[PDB]
Amino acid sequence: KEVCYERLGCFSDDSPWSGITERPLHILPWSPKDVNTRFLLYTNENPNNFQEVAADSSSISGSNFKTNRKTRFIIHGFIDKGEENWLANVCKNLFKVESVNCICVDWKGGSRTGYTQASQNIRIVGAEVAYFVEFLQSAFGYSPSNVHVIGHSLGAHAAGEAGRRTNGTIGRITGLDPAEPCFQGTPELVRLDPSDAKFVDVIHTDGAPIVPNLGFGMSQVVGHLDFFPNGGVEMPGCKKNILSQIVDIDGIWEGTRDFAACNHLRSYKYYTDSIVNPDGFAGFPCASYNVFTANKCFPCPSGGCPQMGHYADRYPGKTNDVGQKFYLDTGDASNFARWRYKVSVTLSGKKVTGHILVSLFGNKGNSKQYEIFKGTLKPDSTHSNEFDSDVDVGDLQMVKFIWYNNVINPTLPRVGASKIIVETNVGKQFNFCSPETVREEVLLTLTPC
Amino acid sequence: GIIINLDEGELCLNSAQCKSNCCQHDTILSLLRCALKARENSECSAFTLYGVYYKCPCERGLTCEGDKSLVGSITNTNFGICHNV
Ligand SMILES: CCCCCCCCCCCC(=O)OC[C@H](COP(=O)(O)OCC[N+](C)(C)C)OC(=O)CCCCCCCCCCC
Ligand SMILES: [Ca+2]
Numbered sequence: 001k002e003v004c005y006e007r008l009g010c011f012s013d014d015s016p017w018s019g020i021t022e023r024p025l026h027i028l029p030w031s032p033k034d035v036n037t038r039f040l041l042y043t044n045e046n047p048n049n050f051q052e053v054a055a056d057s058s059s060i061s062g063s064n065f066k067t068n069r070k071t072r073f074i075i076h077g078f079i080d081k082g083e084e085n086w087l088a089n090v091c092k093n094l095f096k097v098e099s100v101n102c103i104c105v106d107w108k109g110g111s112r113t114g115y116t117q118a119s120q121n122i123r124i125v126g127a128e129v130a131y132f133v134e135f136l137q138s139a140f141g142y143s144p145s146n147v148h149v150i151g152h153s154l155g156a157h158a159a160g161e162a163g164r165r166t167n168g169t170i171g172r173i174t175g176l177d178p179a180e181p182c183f184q185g186t187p188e189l190v191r192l193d194p195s196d197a198k199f200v201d202v203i204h205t206d207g208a209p210i211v212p213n214l215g216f217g218m219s220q221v222v223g224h225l226d227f228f229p230n231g232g233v234e235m236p237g238c239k240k241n242i243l244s245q246i247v248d249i250d251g252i253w254e255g256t257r258d259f260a261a262c263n264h265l266r267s268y269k270y271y272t273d274s275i276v277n278p279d280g281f282a283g284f285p286c287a288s289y290n291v292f293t294a295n296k297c298f299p300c301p302s303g304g305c306p307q308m309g310h311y312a313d314r315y316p317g318k319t320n321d322v323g324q325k326f327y328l329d330t331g332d333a334s335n336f337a338r339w340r341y342k343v344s345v346t347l348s349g350k351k352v353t354g355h356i357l358v359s360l361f362g363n364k365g366n367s368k369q370y371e372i373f374k375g376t377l378k379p380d381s382t383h384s385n386e387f388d389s390d391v392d393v394g395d396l397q398m399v400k401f402i403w404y405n406n407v408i409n410p411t412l413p414r415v416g417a418s419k420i421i422v423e424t425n426v427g428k429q430f431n432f433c434s435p436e437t438v439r440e441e442v443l444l445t446l447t448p449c
Numbered sequence: 450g451i452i453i454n455l456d457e458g459e460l461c462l463n464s465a466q467c468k469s470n471c472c473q474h475d476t477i478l479s480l481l482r483c484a485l486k487a488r489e490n491s492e493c494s495a496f497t498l499y500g501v502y503y504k505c506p507c508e509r510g511l512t513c514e515g516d517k518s519l520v521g522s523i524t525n526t527n528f529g530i531c532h533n534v
Contacts, residue, residue, distance in 0.1 A: 237458060241451060244460035244482055333458055357509075359489065368488050369508050400489075400533065402510045443510030443533045 003028045007055075008127040017120075022186045025116055029123040035110030037128040039073075040082050041065055042091045042102045050088075050104060055135040064101075067142045070171075071101040073129060073162075077153030077179065078118050082106025086268050090150065093275040094310075105129060111154070119182040122154055126161020133166055144169040145198065152176040152268050153216065156202075157183055160192030160222075163200075172199040172313055176267035177217030181210050184218040192222045194322040201225040201312040203270055204232035206263040216264040221323035225315065227308040229270060229281075229330045231289035236332035238262035249333070273336045274309025279392065280337025281308040282425050283326030292327035295386045298342050299427045329388040338388035342423040345372055345401065346382045349415035349437035353377065354405035356415075359443075360422060364394030369402060377403065377415055396422050396430040401444040414439055420446055457483045463500045471505035487513070487531050495527045507531035 004010035013019075013026040029035070040050035043064040053059040065071070072094060074087045082104040091102035105128075110121030129149060136142035147170045151159030156175030163170045175192045178184075183191045194200045202223035208215025219232070230236055238258065245262070248255030257265055274281050282305040286297035299305075306315035306326055317324075330336035343358050354377050357369040368390070373383035401417040416437035423429045433449035450456045454468055460482045461472035467483035474481040481501040486508050487493040493513035494504040503525065507513050515529025516522060 240456065240459055244458065247460065247480065366489055368485075369510075400510075404509060441509050445533070 001026070001028065005032050005124075007131055008032060008124065011123055011127075016187050016190050017123075020186060022184070023119075023182050023190070027117060027120045029120045030110055030117065031121065031124045032128070035107050035121045035124045035128075037110075037125055038082065038106045039132060040104040040106055042088065042104065043069075044095045044099050047092065047095055053103070055132045057139050060136070060140065065103075066099075066101065067136070067140045069099040069101060070146050070148060071103060071136070071142075072148040072150060073103045073105055073159075075105045075125065075129070075149065075151035075155030075158045076107075076111070077151075077155045078111055078115060080111060081108035086265075086272065090268065090272050090275070093272055096276055103132075105155075105158075107158070115181065118154055119157075119179070122158045123161055125155075125158040127165060129158065129162035130165035133162065133170065145171050147171050148174070149197070150174045150176065150268075150271065151192075153179045153264065156192050157190075160196040163196030164189070168195055168197060170197045172201065173197040174271065174312075175200065175202045175222060176271055177203065177205050177264050178222055179216060180218035181216075184220050194222070194224050199224055199313055199318055201306075201318070202227065203267045203308055204228045205230075205235050205267045205270070206261075207232040208234070216261060217267070221325065224319050224322055225283070225306055225312050225324055225326060227283055227306075227312070227326045227328065228289060229266075229308060229328050231292075231327065233263075235263040235266040236330065238266070269334065270330055270336050271309045273334065274307060274311065277335070277337035278307065278311050280339065281328060281330065282306075282340070283308050283312075283328050284340075284425075285324065286327045288325075289327050295342070295384065297327065298340060298386050299423060299425045305425060331390065335390075338390055339392040340386055340388045340425055342384060342386045343370075343372055343399075344382050344384040344419075344421045344423075345417045346380070346419045347377055347415060348379045348418045350411075350413040351376065351378045352403075352405060352409070352413045352415055354403040354415065354440070356383065356401065356403045356417070358420065359400045359402075360389065360393045360396055361398035361400070362393030362396045365391045367391050367393060379415075395428075396432075397448070399430075399432045399446050401434070401438075401446060402441065403438075404441050412439070416444055417446060419449075455483045457485065459483050461501065464502065469505070472501040473503065473505050474501060475503070487511075489531050489533060491531055493529050493531050495529065497523075497525070497527065499525060504528050 002010040002012040018026040045064040087104040149159040156178035159173040200223040206217035207219035246255040286292040355374040370387040372385040414437035432446040434446040464472040473484040511531040513529035
């Protein structure tokens with residue numbers, strides 16, 4: 001059952017668009033008149049008011065779009081509109097680091113309707129974004145390599161159509177938590193998959209099952225690089241009780257959204273944050289997440305850790321294989337950037353039972369004490385742990401050690417650290433030494449060695 | 450977390466609710482929600498009677514150095530910086 005439109009072509013409910021296990025219902029895209037896609041242009045010139053544009057020379061000509069800079073299209077998902085503040089705020093962040101044509105794609109006439117129909121309307125949106133990219137190339141000789149399509153959830157698959165239709169020539173697509181229902185498990189046609197663009201990178205933040213767990217994003221790997229922050233299933237900050245979740249640090253709206261879809265919306269908050277933290281979301285290649293937390297995937301390889309987000313395209317190995325998984329950890333609330341360190345403590349003093357904590361000191365800053373070990377503290381054993389500092393402390397100048405236990409032992413024992421070694425995510429190792437042991441709750445400074 | 454063992458960011462009426470024993474808020478009529486104990490070289494308040502902080506107290510081994518003695522600051526503004534002793 002085909003449905004053809006002028007400029008966009010025909011749409012048919014044939015397999016695999018309908019009638020597969022994953023997509024039973026035979027539904028067609030609406031529209032084009034109804035979905036009603038609009039390109040709301042924001043540029044460094046006009047950072048605050050978009051100017052609506054279209055695929056015709058008098059619109060591109062009459063606006064701040066410059067063919068001399070890159071074009072980053074942001075596509076939203078189910079239920080949003082392109083006027084939602086997170087699309088404008090990816091732009092507001094992009095302008096701090098570049099001259100870019102930021103086109104927010106609004107398709108709310110097709111997104112505020114039943115999910116099964118919003119999954120099909122995607123097709124008109126991808127068709128609509130392709131035509132504008134085709135037209136920048138025909139009219140203004142602007143190569144698809146300059147185009148980046150950032151699409152969140154159902155918008156990630158919209159991006160995947162855009163690239164499919166320009167087959168593979170667009171620069172990159174960034175699928176931010178691609179929607180799982182009606183896509184996970186289906187062929188490359190019907191979804192975002194590494195072939196729809198020259199580079200595809202994904203951020204996975206809700207990889208749980210839609211039923212039973214109401215995990216909106218997908219767990220499957222659809223990009224050259226697929227990043228799984230906090231292991232991609234459950235995000236820090238998202239398990240806050242409904243009243244402090246809705247009542248947010250500003251926004252009943254941003255609160256309500258996170259009550260409804262926290263994890264799933266965390267993907268564009270990490271991306272938005274990466275723009276201005278260019279080293280702050282390093283990606284550790286690992287067999288899994290459980291291994292990464294087993295302290296077995298650090299540091300980065302001589303090669304590098306890709307940055308999750310806006311600078312993943314700076315990763316040298318980026319298109320070397322499809323579906324490469326990177327694990328990493330972020331913050332619970334904004335400024336999600338974290339800097340993982342590894343620390344090995346070699347103990348001295350009396351065998352006691354405690355917690356040992358470390359603090360790092362470097363030229364750029366210092367840190368929270370992190371816990372490296374809690375257990376039998378036997379002298380001469382070593383104990384390492386990796387941890388996501390919230391501060392990149394620079395080059396290490398000092399490290400201070402402190403322990404405490406739960407039960408007061410009147411023998412009054414003293415424990416210390418003869419050698420602590422901090423290793424950075426690149427592998428820089430800094431060694432520190434001290435011959436002193438200290439009491440419970442006293443802070444042992446260790447100096448360079 | 451629900452009404453005790455509150456995670457940082459959970460709305461808070463008294464610091465013992467919070468896992469970090471620190472309920473804090475920027476200003477006076479501000480919603481109080483669980484936060485950090487302060488680290489070395491960040492501002493801090495000394496432990497108070499009042500229940501929620503404007504500046505959390507320090508990590509262990511650390512001393513919030515400022516002028517405590519003052520009744521008045523021993524009310525809500527007993528602030529300091531976390532020094533190791
Ligand atoms: C149970 C089966 C449902 C099937 C659909 C599941 C989603 C799968 C694809 C991912 C969705 C996507 O593309 O990202 C789109 C996201 C998430 O929408 P959602 O994930 O559907 O959340 C499900 C709940 N809703 C349907 C209500 C969204 O935008 C959002 O901020 C959703 C925020 C809506 C906030 C509720 C506000 C109420 C009004 C304002 C009060 C002042
Ligand atoms: Ca595809």
